[PDB]
């Protein structure tokens, strides 16, 4: 089998930037006409992949210019001129020189931008939950920049560790923050024995958290 | 225009068979090769095998040469992929890709999604979540939606039946104790909610379950 080694596993590039992307394989790719079979491909979140180039240098219908592949031999390059929001994904090269057809593991381009701070909703058990029986809190941590951040939750002033579930969305497309989700999971019985919640953001000692509150208690 | 349609999402026990369709519209059927593919995780991509449709002949990737068997109904332009003996290892995103060797040309299925497990179909619970009681008049309004403890994979959630999509981040479920939990906020404007009527529009194929929750001013 052609095994293909892609190079880096991640990159991480600002905007109008170039971007570089390797793939190197265990053997000749000519076919026995000549022509190289190398394929790249992109998948976006939550897509399937779409392929990109073919035949090495070939770009497929209505791919931007700023997108080139080039093959020396077993080694073979995308380049993108210059990186813009819709170039985020993983981007996997495929040989279909030889069967079986086989693909690199695929890289990750992800975008460098200005730091930026997540906006911070709490937010209460809703009755429906508490009629239930159960009692979840739901912290939103949206829009923040880079992917690294901390959430502190503190349930009458002292700090929780025990079920919390933290879930990140992709890069976004549109601004390149990422967002995060944070879920503190309770009985009944215990949210209704305590009254202060509160959400904490962090990155870094150094950064004021960005902090958000309520009692149950009151309205 | 080329399009494919593959089969719904499905929950399997181990040791059991599974047919998946692929149906193809907006070319000539018998004049693409389909090819199978397996994504594991999100990531890794491995190339299963393909069927000349004209004709039915198969060549298959020793990987999957007996676990894999592919055939086609012309009459439906149908493409079907046959897997047996399954495991959790078989638990993946499978995707249905037709090449036009004449045009060169490759198109991919949105992909038919695979749980291989004996746990049992859960309908989740779903809950509105509206903001904290308080008066902060910020410029922006912030609402939620969780969605707790289902099975299989995967939900959909959309907001006002997907119509209202800026704004909204959809969190990646996760999985603990057997369950999936997931949460979805969206962001609009002061002006908007409450007098305008958002609601959380819950799908889970796997138990038939569709609801929708109003989300609506607490307390
Ligand atoms: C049957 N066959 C070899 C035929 C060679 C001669 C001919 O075309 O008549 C063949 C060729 C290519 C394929 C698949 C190619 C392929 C699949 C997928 C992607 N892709 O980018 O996803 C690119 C290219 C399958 C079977």
């Known amino acids: 089998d052609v095994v293909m080694t892609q190079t880096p596993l991640t990159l991480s590039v600002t905007i109008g930037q170039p971007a570089s992307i390797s793939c190197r394989s265990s053997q000749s790719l000519l076919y026995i006409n000549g022509k190289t079979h190398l394929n790249w491909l992109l998948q976006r979140p939550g897509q399937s992949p779409k392929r990109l180039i073919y035949l090495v240098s070939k770009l497929d219908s209505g791919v931007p210019d700023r997108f080139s592949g080039s093959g020396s031999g077993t080694d073979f390059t995308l380049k993108i001129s210059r990186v813009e929001a819709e170039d985020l994904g993983i981007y996997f090269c495929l040989q279909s020189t030889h069967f079986p057809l086989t693909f690199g593991a695929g890289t990750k381009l992800e975008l460098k931008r200005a730091d930026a701070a997540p906006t911070v909703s709490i937010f209460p058990p809703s009755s429906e939950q508490l009629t239930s029986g159960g009692a979840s809190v739901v912290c939103f941590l949206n829009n923040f920049y880079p992917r690294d951040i901390n959430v502190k939750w503190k349930i009458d002033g002292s700090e929780r560790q025990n079920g919390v579930l933290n879930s990140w969305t992709d890069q976004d497309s549109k601004d390149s923050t990422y967002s995060m989700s944070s879920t503190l999971t309770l009985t009944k019985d215990e949210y209704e024995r305590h009254n202060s919640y509160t959400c904490e953001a962090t990155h870094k000692t150094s950064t004021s958290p960005i902090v958000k509150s309520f009692n149950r208690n009151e309205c | 225009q080329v399009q494919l349609q593959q089969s719904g999402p499905v929950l399997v026990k181990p040791g059991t068979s599974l047919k998946m369709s692929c149906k193809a519209s907006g070319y000539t059927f018998t004049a693409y090769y389909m090819n199978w593919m397996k994504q594991s995780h999100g990531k890794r991509l491995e190339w299963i095998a393909v069927?000349?449709?004209?004709?039915?002949?198969?060549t298959y990737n020793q990987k999957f040469k007996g676990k894999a068997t592919l055939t086609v109904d012309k009459s439906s332009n149908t493409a079907y992929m046959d897997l047996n003996s399954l495991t959790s290892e078989d638990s993946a995103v499978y995707y249905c890709?037709?090449?036009?060797?004449?045009?060169?040309?490759?198109?991919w299925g949105h992909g038919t999604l695979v749980t291989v497990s004996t746990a049992k179909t859960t309908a989740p619970s779903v809950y509105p979540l509206a903001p904290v009681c308080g008066g902060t008049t910020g410029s922006s309004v912030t609402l939620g939606c969780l969605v707790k403890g289902y099975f299989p994979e995967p939900v959909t959630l959309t907001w006002n039946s997907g119509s209202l999509s800026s704004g909204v981040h959809t969190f990646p479920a996760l999985l603990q104790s057997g369950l999936y939990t997931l949460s979805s906020s969206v962001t609009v404007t002061s002006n908007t909610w409450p007098s305008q009527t958002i609601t959380c529009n819950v799908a889970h194929p796997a138990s038939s379950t569709k609801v929708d929750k109003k989300i609506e001013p607490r307390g």
């Open positions: 890709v037709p090449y036009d060797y004449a045009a060169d040309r490759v198109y």
């Open positions: 069927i000349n449709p004209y004709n039915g002949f198969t």
